[PDB]
Write a protein that binds this DNA or RNA. Structure first.
Ligand SMILES: [Mg+2]
Ligand SMILES: [Mg+2]
Ligand SMILES: [Mg+2]
Ligand SMILES: [Mg+2]
Ligand SMILES: [Mg+2]
Ligand SMILES: [Mg+2]
Ligand SMILES: [Mg+2]
Ligand SMILES: [Mg+2]
Ligand SMILES: [Mg+2]
Ligand SMILES: [Mg+2]
Ligand SMILES: [Mg+2]
Ligand SMILES: [Mg+2]
Ligand SMILES: [Mg+2]
Ligand SMILES: [Mg+2]
Ligand SMILES: [Mg+2]
Ligand SMILES: [Mg+2]
Ligand SMILES: [Mg+2]
Ligand SMILES: [Mg+2]
Ligand SMILES: [Mg+2]
Ligand SMILES: [Mg+2]
Ligand SMILES: [Mg+2]
Ligand SMILES: [Mg+2]
Ligand SMILES: [Mg+2]
Ligand SMILES: [Mg+2]
Ligand SMILES: [Mg+2]
Ligand SMILES: [Mg+2]
Ligand SMILES: [Mg+2]
Ligand SMILES: [Mg+2]
Ligand SMILES: [Mg+2]
Ligand SMILES: [Mg+2]
Ligand SMILES: [Mg+2]
Ligand SMILES: [Mg+2]
Ligand SMILES: [Mg+2]
Ligand SMILES: [Mg+2]
Ligand SMILES: [Mg+2]
Ligand SMILES: [Mg+2]
Ligand SMILES: [Mg+2]
Ligand SMILES: [Mg+2]
Ligand SMILES: [Mg+2]
Ligand SMILES: [Mg+2]
Ligand SMILES: [Mg+2]
Ligand SMILES: [Mg+2]
Ligand SMILES: [Mg+2]
Ligand SMILES: [Mg+2]
Ligand SMILES: [Mg+2]
Ligand SMILES: [Mg+2]
Ligand SMILES: [Mg+2]
Ligand SMILES: [Mg+2]
Ligand SMILES: [Mg+2]
Ligand SMILES: [Mg+2]
Ligand SMILES: [Mg+2]
Ligand SMILES: [Mg+2]
Ligand SMILES: [Mg+2]
Ligand SMILES: [Mg+2]
Ligand SMILES: [Mg+2]
Ligand SMILES: [Mg+2]
Ligand SMILES: [Mg+2]
Ligand SMILES: [Mg+2]
Ligand SMILES: [Mg+2]
Ligand SMILES: [Mg+2]
Ligand SMILES: [Mg+2]
Ligand SMILES: [Mg+2]
Ligand SMILES: [Mg+2]
Ligand SMILES: [Mg+2]
Ligand SMILES: [Mg+2]
Ligand SMILES: [Mg+2]
Ligand SMILES: [Mg+2]
Ligand SMILES: [Mg+2]
Ligand SMILES: [Mg+2]
Ligand SMILES: [Mg+2]
Ligand SMILES: [Mg+2]
Ligand SMILES: [Mg+2]
Ligand SMILES: [Mg+2]
Ligand SMILES: [Mg+2]
Ligand SMILES: [Mg+2]
Ligand SMILES: [Mg+2]
Ligand SMILES: [Mg+2]
Ligand SMILES: [Mg+2]
Ligand SMILES: [Mg+2]
Ligand SMILES: [Mg+2]
Ligand SMILES: [Mg+2]
Ligand SMILES: [Mg+2]
Ligand SMILES: [Mg+2]
Ligand SMILES: [Mg+2]
Ligand SMILES: [Mg+2]
Ligand SMILES: [Mg+2]
Ligand SMILES: [Mg+2]
Ligand SMILES: [Mg+2]
Ligand SMILES: [Mg+2]
Ligand SMILES: [Mg+2]
Ligand SMILES: [Mg+2]
Ligand SMILES: [Mg+2]
Ligand SMILES: [Mg+2]
Ligand SMILES: [Mg+2]
Ligand SMILES: [Mg+2]
Ligand SMILES: [Mg+2]
Ligand SMILES: [Mg+2]
Ligand SMILES: [Mg+2]
Ligand SMILES: [Mg+2]
Ligand SMILES: [Mg+2]
Ligand SMILES: [Mg+2]
Ligand SMILES: [Mg+2]
Ligand SMILES: [Mg+2]
Ligand SMILES: [Mg+2]
Ligand SMILES: [Mg+2]
Ligand SMILES: [Mg+2]
Ligand SMILES: [Mg+2]
Ligand SMILES: [Mg+2]
Ligand SMILES: [Mg+2]
Ligand SMILES: [Mg+2]
Ligand SMILES: [Mg+2]
Ligand SMILES: [Mg+2]
Ligand SMILES: [Mg+2]
Ligand SMILES: [Mg+2]
Ligand SMILES: [Mg+2]
Ligand SMILES: [Mg+2]
Ligand SMILES: [Mg+2]
Ligand SMILES: [Mg+2]
Ligand SMILES: [Mg+2]
Ligand SMILES: [Mg+2]
Ligand SMILES: [Mg+2]
Ligand SMILES: [Mg+2]
Ligand SMILES: [Mg+2]
Ligand SMILES: [Mg+2]
Ligand SMILES: [Mg+2]
Ligand SMILES: [Mg+2]
Ligand SMILES: [Mg+2]
Ligand SMILES: [Mg+2]
Ligand SMILES: [Mg+2]
Ligand SMILES: [Mg+2]
Ligand SMILES: [Mg+2]
Ligand SMILES: [Mg+2]
Ligand SMILES: [Mg+2]
Ligand SMILES: [Mg+2]
Ligand SMILES: [Mg+2]
Ligand SMILES: [Mg+2]
Ligand SMILES: [Mg+2]
Ligand SMILES: [Mg+2]
Ligand SMILES: [Mg+2]
Ligand SMILES: [Mg+2]
Ligand SMILES: [Mg+2]
Ligand SMILES: [Mg+2]
Ligand SMILES: [Mg+2]
Ligand SMILES: [Mg+2]
Ligand SMILES: [Mg+2]
Ligand SMILES: [Mg+2]
Ligand SMILES: [Mg+2]
Ligand SMILES: [Mg+2]
Ligand SMILES: [Mg+2]
Ligand SMILES: [Mg+2]
Ligand SMILES: [Mg+2]
Ligand SMILES: [Mg+2]
Ligand SMILES: [Mg+2]
Ligand SMILES: [Mg+2]
Ligand SMILES: [Mg+2]
Ligand SMILES: [Mg+2]
Ligand SMILES: [Mg+2]
Ligand SMILES: [Mg+2]
Ligand SMILES: [Mg+2]
Ligand SMILES: [Mg+2]
Ligand SMILES: [Mg+2]
Ligand SMILES: [Mg+2]
Ligand SMILES: [Mg+2]
Ligand SMILES: [Mg+2]
Ligand SMILES: [Mg+2]
Ligand SMILES: [Mg+2]
Ligand SMILES: [Mg+2]
Ligand SMILES: [Mg+2]
Ligand SMILES: [Mg+2]
Ligand SMILES: [Mg+2]
Ligand SMILES: [Mg+2]
Ligand SMILES: [Mg+2]
Ligand SMILES: [Mg+2]
Ligand SMILES: [Mg+2]
Ligand SMILES: [Mg+2]
Ligand SMILES: [Mg+2]
Ligand SMILES: [Mg+2]
Ligand SMILES: [Mg+2]
Ligand SMILES: [Mg+2]
Ligand SMILES: [Mg+2]
Ligand SMILES: [Mg+2]
Ligand SMILES: [Mg+2]
Ligand SMILES: [Mg+2]
Ligand SMILES: [Mg+2]
Ligand SMILES: [Mg+2]
Ligand SMILES: [Mg+2]
Ligand SMILES: [Mg+2]
Ligand SMILES: [Mg+2]
Ligand SMILES: [Mg+2]
Ligand SMILES: [Mg+2]
Ligand SMILES: [Mg+2]
Ligand SMILES: [Mg+2]
Ligand SMILES: [Mg+2]
Ligand SMILES: [Mg+2]
Ligand SMILES: [Mg+2]
Ligand SMILES: [Mg+2]
Ligand SMILES: [Mg+2]
Ligand SMILES: [Mg+2]
Ligand SMILES: [Mg+2]
Ligand SMILES: [Mg+2]
Ligand SMILES: [Mg+2]
Ligand SMILES: [Mg+2]
Ligand SMILES: [Mg+2]
Ligand SMILES: [Mg+2]
Ligand SMILES: [Mg+2]
Ligand SMILES: [Mg+2]
Ligand SMILES: [Mg+2]
Ligand SMILES: [Mg+2]
Ligand SMILES: [Mg+2]
Ligand SMILES: [Mg+2]
Ligand SMILES: [Mg+2]
Ligand SMILES: [Mg+2]
Ligand SMILES: [Mg+2]
Ligand SMILES: [Mg+2]
Ligand SMILES: [Mg+2]
Ligand SMILES: [Mg+2]
Ligand SMILES: [Mg+2]
Ligand SMILES: [Mg+2]
Ligand SMILES: [Mg+2]
Ligand SMILES: [Mg+2]
Ligand SMILES: [Mg+2]
Ligand SMILES: [Mg+2]
Ligand SMILES: [Mg+2]
Ligand SMILES: [Mg+2]
Ligand SMILES: [Mg+2]
Ligand SMILES: [Mg+2]
Ligand SMILES: [Mg+2]
Ligand SMILES: [Mg+2]
Ligand SMILES: [Mg+2]
Ligand SMILES: [Mg+2]
Ligand SMILES: [Mg+2]
Ligand SMILES: [Mg+2]
Ligand SMILES: [Mg+2]
Ligand SMILES: [Mg+2]
Ligand SMILES: [Mg+2]
Ligand SMILES: [Mg+2]
Ligand SMILES: [Mg+2]
Ligand SMILES: [Mg+2]
Ligand SMILES: [Mg+2]
Ligand SMILES: [Mg+2]
Ligand SMILES: [Mg+2]
Ligand SMILES: [Mg+2]
Ligand SMILES: [Mg+2]
Ligand SMILES: [Mg+2]
Ligand SMILES: [Mg+2]
Ligand SMILES: [Mg+2]
Ligand SMILES: [Mg+2]
Ligand SMILES: [Mg+2]
Ligand SMILES: [Mg+2]
Ligand SMILES: [Mg+2]
Ligand SMILES: [Mg+2]
Ligand SMILES: [Mg+2]
Ligand SMILES: [Mg+2]
Ligand SMILES: [Mg+2]
Ligand SMILES: [Mg+2]
Ligand SMILES: [Mg+2]
Ligand SMILES: [Mg+2]
Ligand SMILES: [Mg+2]
Ligand SMILES: [Mg+2]
Ligand SMILES: [Mg+2]
Ligand SMILES: [Mg+2]
Ligand SMILES: [Mg+2]
Ligand SMILES: [Mg+2]
Ligand SMILES: [Mg+2]
Ligand SMILES: [Mg+2]
Ligand SMILES: [Mg+2]
Ligand SMILES: [Mg+2]
Ligand SMILES: [Mg+2]
Ligand SMILES: [Mg+2]
Ligand SMILES: [Mg+2]
Lengths: 76, 144, 134
RNA sequence: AAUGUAAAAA
RNA sequence: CGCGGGGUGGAGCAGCCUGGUAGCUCGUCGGGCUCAUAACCCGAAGGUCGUCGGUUCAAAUCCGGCCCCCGCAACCA
RNA sequence: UAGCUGGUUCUCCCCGAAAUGACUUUAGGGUCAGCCUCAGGCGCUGACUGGGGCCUGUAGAGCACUGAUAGGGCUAGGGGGCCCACCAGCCUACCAAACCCUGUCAAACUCCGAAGGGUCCCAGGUGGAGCCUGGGAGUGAGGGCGCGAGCGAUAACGUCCGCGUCCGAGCGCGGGAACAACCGAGACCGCCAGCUAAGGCCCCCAAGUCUGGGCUAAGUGGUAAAGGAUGUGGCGCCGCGAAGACAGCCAGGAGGUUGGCUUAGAAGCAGCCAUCCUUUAAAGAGUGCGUAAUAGCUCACUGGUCGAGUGGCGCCGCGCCGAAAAUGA
RNA sequence: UGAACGGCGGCCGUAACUAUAACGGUCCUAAGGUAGCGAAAUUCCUUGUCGGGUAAGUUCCGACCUGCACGAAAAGCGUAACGACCGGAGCGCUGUCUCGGCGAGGGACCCGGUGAAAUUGAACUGGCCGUGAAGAUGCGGCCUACCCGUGGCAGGACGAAAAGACCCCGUGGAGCUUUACUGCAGCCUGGUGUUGGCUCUU
RNA sequence: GGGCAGUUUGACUGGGGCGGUCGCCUCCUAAAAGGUAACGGAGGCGCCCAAAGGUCCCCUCAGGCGGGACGGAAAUCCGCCGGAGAGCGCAAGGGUAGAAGGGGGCCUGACUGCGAGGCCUGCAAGCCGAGCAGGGGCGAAAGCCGGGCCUAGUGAACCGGUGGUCCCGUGUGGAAGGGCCAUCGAUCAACGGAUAAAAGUUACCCCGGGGAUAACAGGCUGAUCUCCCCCGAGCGUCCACAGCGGCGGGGAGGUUUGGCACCUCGAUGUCGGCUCGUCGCAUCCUGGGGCUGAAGAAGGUCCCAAGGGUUGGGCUGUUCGCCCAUUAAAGCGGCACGCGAGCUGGGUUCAGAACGUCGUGAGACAGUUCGGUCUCUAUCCGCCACGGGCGCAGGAGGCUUGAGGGGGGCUC
RNA sequence: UCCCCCGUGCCCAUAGCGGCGUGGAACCACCCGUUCCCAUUCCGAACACGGAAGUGAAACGCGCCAGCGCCGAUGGUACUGGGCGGGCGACCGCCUGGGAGAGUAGGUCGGUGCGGGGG
């Protein structure tokens, strides 16, 4: 019957959708690879995690052959 | 082992078990109707595994019953006798005086040295097959 | 064949793709009910078909068993079925064309297909090549 | 460091 | 069905765990001593490594399914 | 000692669960979370809804990837045959890589891709909504039903999850003959008042033996399948017909021919392979029976008579057979 | 060191028909089960096969041996006599039976005297077919049925009795076991106290 | 050092044991957020690397075709097509050449002191992280570096080891010994880890509980079993259905074996026999038919039909089955496998004992063998009989009608 | 405002593959050379410097062509929030709102922003 196995659920995916206000440093997206590329005011960590770089608003940009991007349009 | 031939019986088992043995028949009796040879089994708690084993057993015996009858019709064709002793021969090959001789056709010859090399045609053709089929061809066309 | 292992049962929902048209031969036999058709079924139909018209025309078979049909061996509840006792079946939603015939009189193919129907669990229909094409 | 059968004395 | 072991020259066994080259005894074959055979002496040949897949630069060797043989187990009511 | 079983005593009022998750020598026990309640505090935010933005890979479909797959084409490789050896050549109603055409399958395949769902913003929403801190809990065996999957056997009042829902705690009321969870509906108390819901309105039993148009002759209805049949009614299509059909009845129904071949025999009639003509108004190198092989009978087809319709096929409604069980229906 | 605990092989081949294998090959062991016995108080397949007995014999007796899984002091094989031991057969005799009948006495039954028990939710406690927690006097539909007792039968009241002994559960209990753990008694052991003198010796 | 003593001897589990499993990662199941179970389908981890790391600089795969001394499908060279099917240490997935991939120069940031704000979450854990300070590495610089393309490669606390320092030092000074910092000892793998330390047996057994859970029976189910149909390859010399029916297909029944675990564990007594039966019909006989490959007699096959009938022995506890002698036939099922408040108790299923077998052992066996306590009193329903009461719209004696039941039902 | 060219962005194939044609004044490229800076695991191929001559062959720039590639409706359908209705079921049917994929008709060899040189 050798089969009763699996591994923990990692609860990844988009953590902050477009339009949502965000504090600097808080996380935008956890992902397997780069299903989302960083972009303006958004850094990326060892696991490919995208995190806002300054208080602002999240917005997503698709750029075809160049992939999708997550941006934080600042304001204060 | 065609299903149409053998009959299978079910019946409670002899020996230990609890109420399970009394109320649950797991023993099996698979008799072969034509050959009459029967067989019974009940070594396992299950009816199917007994019905299964009792059948693999019957297979073995029915194979050994077909091998016995497979003997008379594949060994009686060899020869109804053949002592290999003295005089049991049917054709002598004398190398001293140089002469073979088929004691069946009474036919003779003068070259044992070549015959024991391939010259069987002269023998089988004219005389051999003749007397061979003769003793059976005169048996049917008269009384047999 | 190849694939891998055994496979979930799924469900025979509406005959959405469970429909078709003739694409080979003049006559065809289409299904009317959803069912898992066994290899032993497909074959028995196909053979009984030629068996009918000896040295006859040519038959086509458009359904093909790729689904492993499992089965536990007279016991209780452990693991997934060793299965495959009936081995393999083909999914058939009502409306799909299964068997094509060709190169025989109508009454010669109205019988061949009439029979292949019987060897099948479901109710089926025979068809002329209407006139609907692409 | 064994063995060698079975047809020959006017 | 469950757990364990095994399948390698014609016979019987090594080699595998630790992948790179398959070894032992017997038999077989050629040549010797003998009047001749055996014994004995000198040579030589012979193996899909059960089967289908997988890993690897590479599989007898490691991984998986199947067929075959062996042993154990099949208990409580 | 008892993580077990039993037992736990007056009344009225308000609210009102859980049978899930995580860990547990844990699995009928516990700790924390979830859900209930009370107190104080905040006060339009709450469920649900409108508009807008972003996130998604199911249903369906698809073959572009990973694989599976029927037929054909083209074509390496191998196999058989001609031919041979210096190796070369052609054939190939054998198997078949790649490729292409047609046709398809896939939870662990996706060029695509819904409905929907999630979340944030704005607005409606004062509700036994919501949020913050605390006191007290119980629950941690659920069950059925609808839907979506796994397991199972596209078995089980089976089993395991997901979204609902009802019983649990509404075995209170109405319907369903009776019957927790199906249909209707949330019982504060009283009334010999009224409208309804599901379901019903011939008698037991309240209310139409109501109205209009059909179908069904089985007690179907009053609970079963493949499959079988000149059941009955209905729409459609093709064909025959007063230039005479369908049915029955009068007559011929053949010649070479006894078809070639298989075979003991195969004379239209076991099987195999099949595509003449002619007397003529018509008769098929033959529908069935009869044979050992034939002759005999018949249809097919033509003539006459009759005198008005007839035959096949597709579709729908209801019905018939298929249909055997043990205390009395 | 075995009348100490204990143990006592596998595969393949070979015969003046076939079958078998006295013989051989090879691998492994500490050594590979000898005599005697053997479908047995041991045999799974099994009612093995053959013979005996019987009209007919899964038992029984005698054999054969492919001993699932005998075997030599947890003794092997026998053995006269003995046995309220266990199995098979026969003669005698029978109500054991075909198959039951009659008769006797002590109860049962009726009258007078004395007078219990388990049990008991309450009862105004019928049949069928359904139904319901899946086996209904108590729900539904239908059938049946005047009220109350006495002698009898045991199908039901999932009848009574005993908080199921079987099964599982409880980080329950207890008896037993050992090369489970940890201890203890006991036995062995060095130092030292009780413990002294003389002499040789390294 | 079991002579004796105190104890341990896990959990999950479509009953339990046996088998398997236990933590971590990948994918599917998962129903387009997240999450989601089963002893559901499939696979990996318990490491590795001082280059396989940092930075700067440069280069771009696999494959296909053509051409080339060894080469020969494939080594290395050249040309043309080729956007990623290669590579990224290792399972899978996501991602990726506008590098995360191949090569080179210098290099050690596989830094210390921190850490805004988050992800995830019952707890505790796990994860991401801009920037500030120190002193650095590569770069001209903008900058990048707090290991590795990413997600596994792991272990609370306790107890102890080694190194170090602003700490404490039992009247004071030292010392002993602690604290703090650093790091070490986990197949605590039953992987949230009971002790520093632990296996079996009970049929000699006991208590507490459970119909939360198995063995009997009922129930649901109908795989299995029995019976019956659809198709018609073929057999039957000729003739597919006299009699048969390949390969397939649809059902009925609830007698078998199972599945499930619904009532009953403050008890529903288990096999066989005996006694007494009653019901079903899918009919063994007898009665009536159709067909026949039915001359007749006798059969074969299907149809109708329960009214009655359906023997005695041998063997075994047997049911079953074999056998003997008959018969018109020696039917099959239901009724808790009908019936133990009716009987038996041979079998199963307590304690004794023995054999083979397994175990060091105590013991154990759907293996065997001999032995082994079956409970006088019927309240109610039901049943067999027999009375008392009242009724039957004057009272009484005798004789009767038959609604409605019951019995009988055989065959040579 | 206009035209050509250079550099650099924006969307991300209707921008691409390929076939034909045109451009050297300007710009760009190839191009001459390898002393110097720099460079090859060999080689001025690449990287680099110094640069006349020649050329527009290559590369690139612009423009045409629809064979490949790519884009691709409308109409209808599958599926489906929500609400119902029929059968033993494996299933099926209606109302309401949403609505694919494939395929048919067609479309495309691009559109634009900032700076600079030039008529
Ligand atoms: Mg799992
Ligand atoms: Mg992408
Ligand atoms: Mg970083
Ligand atoms: Mg037959
Ligand atoms: Mg027996
Ligand atoms: Mg026992
Ligand atoms: Mg027992
Ligand atoms: Mg039973
Ligand atoms: Mg039973
Ligand atoms: Mg084919
Ligand atoms: Mg079970
Ligand atoms: Mg297996
Ligand atoms: Mg002489
Ligand atoms: Mg061999
Ligand atoms: Mg080695
Ligand atoms: Mg070594
Ligand atoms: Mg040799
Ligand atoms: Mg030699
Ligand atoms: Mg020699
Ligand atoms: Mg030599
Ligand atoms: Mg040689
Ligand atoms: Mg191998
Ligand atoms: Mg073998
Ligand atoms: Mg063998
Ligand atoms: Mg065993
Ligand atoms: Mg066991
Ligand atoms: Mg057992
Ligand atoms: Mg036991
Ligand atoms: Mg036991
Ligand atoms: Mg026990
Ligand atoms: Mg209140
Ligand atoms: Mg309330
Ligand atoms: Mg507990
Ligand atoms: Mg709590
Ligand atoms: Mg508000
Ligand atoms: Mg997509
Ligand atoms: Mg789909
Ligand atoms: Mg394409
Ligand atoms: Mg592929
Ligand atoms: Mg691949
Ligand atoms: Mg060709
Ligand atoms: Mg070739
Ligand atoms: Mg050649
Ligand atoms: Mg060649
Ligand atoms: Mg050729
Ligand atoms: Mg899919
Ligand atoms: Mg996937
Ligand atoms: Mg859609
Ligand atoms: Mg929403
Ligand atoms: Mg108000
Ligand atoms: Mg409330
Ligand atoms: Mg509230
Ligand atoms: Mg609030
Ligand atoms: Mg509270
Ligand atoms: Mg609590
Ligand atoms: Mg719990
Ligand atoms: Mg539960
Ligand atoms: Mg529910
Ligand atoms: Mg449903
Ligand atoms: Mg399951
Ligand atoms: Mg299904
Ligand atoms: Mg169900
Ligand atoms: Mg409750
Ligand atoms: Mg409620
Ligand atoms: Mg009730
Ligand atoms: Mg009523
Ligand atoms: Mg109800
Ligand atoms: Mg009620
Ligand atoms: Mg209710
Ligand atoms: Mg309604
Ligand atoms: Mg009514
Ligand atoms: Mg019906
Ligand atoms: Mg039906
Ligand atoms: Mg019907
Ligand atoms: Mg029908
Ligand atoms: Mg008919
Ligand atoms: Mg006409
Ligand atoms: Mg006219
Ligand atoms: Mg007519
Ligand atoms: Mg007439
Ligand atoms: Mg005539
Ligand atoms: Mg006539
Ligand atoms: Mg004529
Ligand atoms: Mg005619
Ligand atoms: Mg005539
Ligand atoms: Mg003719
Ligand atoms: Mg004629
Ligand atoms: Mg005649
Ligand atoms: Mg129709
Ligand atoms: Mg119709
Ligand atoms: Mg009938
Ligand atoms: Mg009855
Ligand atoms: Mg000795
Ligand atoms: Mg021994
Ligand atoms: Mg032994
Ligand atoms: Mg021999
Ligand atoms: Mg020795
Ligand atoms: Mg022995
Ligand atoms: Mg004896
Ligand atoms: Mg015996
Ligand atoms: Mg015997
Ligand atoms: Mg045994
Ligand atoms: Mg025996
Ligand atoms: Mg026996
Ligand atoms: Mg016998
Ligand atoms: Mg005999
Ligand atoms: Mg006898
Ligand atoms: Mg005898
Ligand atoms: Mg006897
Ligand atoms: Mg023997
Ligand atoms: Mg023997
Ligand atoms: Mg033996
Ligand atoms: Mg055996
Ligand atoms: Mg055994
Ligand atoms: Mg034995
Ligand atoms: Mg022995
Ligand atoms: Mg001994
Ligand atoms: Mg003795
Ligand atoms: Mg004696
Ligand atoms: Mg005595
Ligand atoms: Mg005695
Ligand atoms: Mg006597
Ligand atoms: Mg008697
Ligand atoms: Mg008396
Ligand atoms: Mg008395
Ligand atoms: Mg007395
Ligand atoms: Mg008295
Ligand atoms: Mg009464
Ligand atoms: Mg009934
Ligand atoms: Mg009820
Ligand atoms: Mg009730
Ligand atoms: Mg009752
Ligand atoms: Mg009621
Ligand atoms: Mg009643
Ligand atoms: Mg009555
Ligand atoms: Mg009395
Ligand atoms: Mg009495
Ligand atoms: Mg009674
Ligand atoms: Mg009594
Ligand atoms: Mg009773
Ligand atoms: Mg109890
Ligand atoms: Mg424990
Ligand atoms: Mg001591
Ligand atoms: Mg001493
Ligand atoms: Mg001492
Ligand atoms: Mg002393
Ligand atoms: Mg002393
Ligand atoms: Mg010790
Ligand atoms: Mg000890
Ligand atoms: Mg179960
Ligand atoms: Mg179990
Ligand atoms: Mg056990
Ligand atoms: Mg276990
Ligand atoms: Mg899981
Ligand atoms: Mg592994
Ligand atoms: Mg690397
Ligand atoms: Mg480059
Ligand atoms: Mg290639
Ligand atoms: Mg090439
Ligand atoms: Mg080449
Ligand atoms: Mg080449
Ligand atoms: Mg070459
Ligand atoms: Mg060379
Ligand atoms: Mg080669
Ligand atoms: Mg080459
Ligand atoms: Mg190249
Ligand atoms: Mg080229
Ligand atoms: Mg790419
Ligand atoms: Mg690819
Ligand atoms: Mg790679
Ligand atoms: Mg890698
Ligand atoms: Mg990947
Ligand atoms: Mg890029
Ligand atoms: Mg590198
Ligand atoms: Mg690099
Ligand atoms: Mg390097
Ligand atoms: Mg900060
Ligand atoms: Mg933080
Ligand atoms: Mg936390
Ligand atoms: Mg906590
Ligand atoms: Mg930083
Ligand atoms: Mg700094
Ligand atoms: Mg950083
Ligand atoms: Mg790396
Ligand atoms: Mg990196
Ligand atoms: Mg790297
Ligand atoms: Mg990840
Ligand atoms: Mg501690
Ligand atoms: Mg400090
Ligand atoms: Mg001091
Ligand atoms: Mg000092
Ligand atoms: Mg420190
Ligand atoms: Mg371990
Ligand atoms: Mg644990
Ligand atoms: Mg542990
Ligand atoms: Mg403790
Ligand atoms: Mg320990
Ligand atoms: Mg432990
Ligand atoms: Mg004892
Ligand atoms: Mg005790
Ligand atoms: Mg219960
Ligand atoms: Mg439980
Ligand atoms: Mg029972
Ligand atoms: Mg019951
Ligand atoms: Mg039927
Ligand atoms: Mg035949
Ligand atoms: Mg025939
Ligand atoms: Mg069926
Ligand atoms: Mg039953
Ligand atoms: Mg059952
Ligand atoms: Mg239960
Ligand atoms: Mg349950
Ligand atoms: Mg009770
Ligand atoms: Mg009782
Ligand atoms: Mg009994
Ligand atoms: Mg009984
Ligand atoms: Mg009759
Ligand atoms: Mg007759
Ligand atoms: Mg006759
Ligand atoms: Mg006759
Ligand atoms: Mg006759
Ligand atoms: Mg007669
Ligand atoms: Mg009839
Ligand atoms: Mg009948
Ligand atoms: Mg009898
Ligand atoms: Mg007889
Ligand atoms: Mg008779
Ligand atoms: Mg008879
Ligand atoms: Mg009879
Ligand atoms: Mg029956
Ligand atoms: Mg009976
Ligand atoms: Mg009973
Ligand atoms: Mg039963
Ligand atoms: Mg019984
Ligand atoms: Mg009794
Ligand atoms: Mg009894
Ligand atoms: Mg009793
Ligand atoms: Mg007794
Ligand atoms: Mg008995
Ligand atoms: Mg006995
Ligand atoms: Mg017993
Ligand atoms: Mg006991
Ligand atoms: Mg005992
Ligand atoms: Mg037994
Ligand atoms: Mg006994
Ligand atoms: Mg008594
Ligand atoms: Mg009662
Ligand atoms: Mg009663
Ligand atoms: Mg009467
Ligand atoms: Mg009567
Ligand atoms: Mg009567
Ligand atoms: Mg009667
Ligand atoms: Mg201008
Ligand atoms: Mg050209
Ligand atoms: Mg130049
Ligand atoms: Mg120089
Ligand atoms: Mg210079
Ligand atoms: Mg320089
Ligand atoms: Mg320069
Ligand atoms: Mg040019
Ligand atoms: Mg170009
Ligand atoms: Mg033009
Ligand atoms: Mg185009
Ligand atoms: Mg549309
Ligand atoms: Mg249905
Ligand atoms: Mg359905
Ligand atoms: Mg729409
Ligand atoms: Mg579209
Ligand atoms: Mg283009
Ligand atoms: Mg533009």
């Amino acid at each position: 019957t050798k089969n009763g196995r699996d591994s923990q659920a990692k609860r990844l995916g988009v953590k902050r959708y477009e339009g949502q206000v965000v504090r600097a440093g808080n996380i935008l997206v956890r992902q397997r690879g780069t299903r989302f590329k960083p972009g303006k005011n958004v850094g990326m960590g060892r696991d490919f995690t995208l995190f806002a770089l300054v208080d602002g608003v999240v917005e997503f940009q698709d750029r075809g052959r160049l992939g999708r991007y997550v941006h934080v349009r600042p304001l204060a | 082992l065609k299903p149409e031939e053998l009959r299978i019986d079910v019946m409670r088992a002899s020996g230990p078990g609890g109420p399970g043995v009394n109320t649950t028949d797991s023993a099996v009796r698979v008799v072969h109707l034509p050959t009459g040879i029967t067989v019974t089994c009940q070594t396992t708690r299950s009816q199917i595994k007994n019905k299964e084993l009792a059948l693999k057993i019957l297979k073995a015996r029915l194979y050994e019953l077909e091998r016995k009858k497979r003997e008379e019709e594949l060994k009686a064709l060899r020869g109804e006798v053949r002592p290999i002793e003295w005089g049991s021969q049917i054709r002598s090959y004398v190398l001293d005086k140089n002469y073979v001789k088929d004691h069946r056709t009474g036919l003779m010859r003068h070259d044992p040295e070549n015959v024991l090399d391939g010259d069987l045609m002269d023998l089988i053709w004219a005389g051999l097959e003749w007397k061979a089929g003769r003793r059976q061809g005169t048996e049917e066309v008269e009384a047999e | 064949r190849m694939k891998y292992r055994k496979q979930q049962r799924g469900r025979l929902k509406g005959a959405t793709k469970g429909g078709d048209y003739v694409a080979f031969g003049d006559f065809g036999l289409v299904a009317l009910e959803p069912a898992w058709i066994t290899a032993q079924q497909i074959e028995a139909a196909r053979v009984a078909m030629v068996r009918h018209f000896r040295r006859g025309g040519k038959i086509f078979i458009r359904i093909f068993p790729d689904k492993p049909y499992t089965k536990k061996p007279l016991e209780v509840r452990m693991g997934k079925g060793k299965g495959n006792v009936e081995g393999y079946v083909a999914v058939v939603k009502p409306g799909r064309v299964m068997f094509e015939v060709a190169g025989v009189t109508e009454e010669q193919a109205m019988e061949a297909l009439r029979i292949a129907g019987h060897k099948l669990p479901i109710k089926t229909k025979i068809v002329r090549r209407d006139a609907y094409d692409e």
